[PDB]
């Protein structure tokens, strides 16, 4: 089934991980035009999420994921659930969000104490921690990049991402796993290196978004190897 994705950047591309994780699967995307990875930024596009879900339905999507973590967590857990209900009601399609994806990924891996490694400024990190706590997880510490650029996220390199995850875990080595948050990051080469070095799993925004959306679509598709314990 064709999977539709609402993505933060204006360009509206399918996030790059899809072709690596699931080369055989069809994805389509619609771009919100988010201007900054900040609460003020989210407020300027959040009301258009329902319309973009409908656009994707009109293009033949059979499920829709809102592929933005902070866009979906910044107002707390209830709003993540409510926005999902709104999308479903507007389209009659199964819908999900990237915040739901990462929650599901951490749960699937049995992660309760979670170290945070993020691209964000601290206001956004505080909101992430509050969301996770509402959902019965225990954030243990946090290291972050403090980036507000949207398209800028794709340019953070692998070595930077590995170092970020390692530093986050170093701060709390009793953690069960690591949440690497920001769906604009290109994390697929970082994940196996971090898991190799540390011995704990990483749940990363974009790959968890794909994993969750493919689960939602129901076909039982398996990801290509080398992308983390989440993919078996
Ligand atoms: O995962 P988040 O918090 O929505 C940030 C993001 C998502 C996609 C592209 C750029 C930035």
**Starting at the edge strand that comes first in sequence, how are the strands of the sheet with 3-7 ordered?**
27-31, 3-7, 63-66, 95-97
Long-range contacts of 197-202 (CB under 8 A, 24+ apart): 197/162, 197/166, 198/165, 198/166, 198/169, 200/169, 200/175, 200/176, 201/109, 201/111, 201/177, 201/228, 201/229, 201/230, 202/165, 202/177, 202/178, 202/228, 202/229, 202/230
User: What is the DSSP code (8-state) at residue 88?
Assistant: H
Short-list 209, 227, 211, CA closest to 73:
209
Distance CA 230, CA 215 (A): 12
- Helices then strands, each counted (H, E), the chain: 10, 8
Number of folded domains in the chain?
1
Q: What's 170's domain CATH number? A: 3.40.50.12500
CA 72 to ligand 1 center in whole angstroms:
10
Q: Judge whether 73 and 183 are in contact, CB under 8 Å.
A: no
**How remote is the C-alpha of 189 from its chain's centroid?**
16
Q: Please tell me the distance from the alpha carbon of residue 198 to that of residue 184, in angstroms, as a whole number.
A: 24
Cβ atoms of residues 178 and 203 within 8 Å: yes
Element (H, E) at 72: helix 69-73
Residue 189: give the domain boundaries: 1-232
Best residue for ligand 1 mutational test, from 14, 153, 204 (most atoms within 8 Å of Cβ):
153
Q: Whose CA is nearest to atom 5 of ligand 1?
A: 182
Q: Which atom of ligand 1 is nearest to the CA of 151?
A: 10
| Closest alpha carbon to 228 in 165, 150, 175 | 165
Q: b/e for 201-226, b at 16 or more Cβ within 10 A?
A: bbbbbbbbbbbbbbbbbeeeeebeee
Sheet holding 138-144, edge to edge: 138-144, 113-118, 177-181, 202-204
Count CB-CB contacts under 10 A for residue 147: 19
Residues 54 and 190 sit within 8 Å (Cβ to Cβ): no
205-217 helix and 98-108 helix, angle to the nearest 10 degrees:
90
CA angle 26, 117, 129 (to 5 degrees): 95
Query: Can you give the C-alpha Rg of the chain in angstroms?
Result: 16
95, containing H or E segment? strand 95-97
* Reported structure resolution in angstroms: 1.5
The CA-atom distances, in angstroms, between 149 and each of 9, 194, 215 are 10, 25, 30
Best residue among 71, 97, 120, 156 to mutate for probing ligand 1, ranked by most atoms within 8 Å of CB: 71
Distance CA 153, CA 34 (A): 13
**CA-proximal residue: ligand 1, atom 8 (nearest):** 184
Nearest residue to 99 (alpha-carbon basis) of 143, 141, 124, 227: 124
Residue 218 and residue 232: Cα distance in Å, rounded?
A: 17
- Residue where the block lists tokens 């990363």: 204
Q: Which two tokens stand for residue 205?
A: 């925004």
């Amino acid at each position: 089934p064709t999977i539709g994705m609402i993505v933060p950047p204006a360009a509206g591309l399918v996030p790059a991980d899809g072709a690596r994780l699931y080369p055989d699967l069809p994805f389509i995307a619609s771009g919100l035009g988010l201007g900054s990875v900040t609460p003020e930024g989210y407020d300027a596009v959040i009301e258009s999420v329902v319309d973009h879900a409908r656009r994707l339905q009109k293009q033949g999507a059979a499920v829709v994921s809102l592929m933005g973590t902070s866009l979906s967590f910044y107002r707390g857990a209830a709003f993540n659930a409510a926005l999902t209900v709104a999308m479903r009601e507007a389209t009659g399609l199964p819908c999900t969000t990237m915040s739901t994806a990462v929650l599901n990924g951490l749960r699937a891996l049995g992660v309760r104490r979670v170290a945070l490694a993020t691209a964000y400024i601290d206001d956004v990190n505080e909101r992430l921690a509050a969301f996770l706590a509402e959902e019965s997880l225990v954030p243990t510490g946090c290291r972050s990049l403090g980036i507000t650029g949207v398209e800028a996220m794709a340019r953070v390199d692998t070595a930077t991402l590995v170092d970020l995850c390692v530093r986050a875990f170093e701060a709390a080595p009793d953690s069960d796993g690591i949440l690497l948050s920001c769906g604009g990051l290109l994390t697929l080469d970082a994940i196996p290196e971090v898991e190799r070095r540390l011995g704990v799993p990483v749940v990363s925004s974009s790959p968890a978004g794909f994993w969750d959306a493919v689960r939602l679509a129901g076909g039982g598709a398996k990801a290509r190897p080398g992308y983390g314990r989440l993919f078996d």
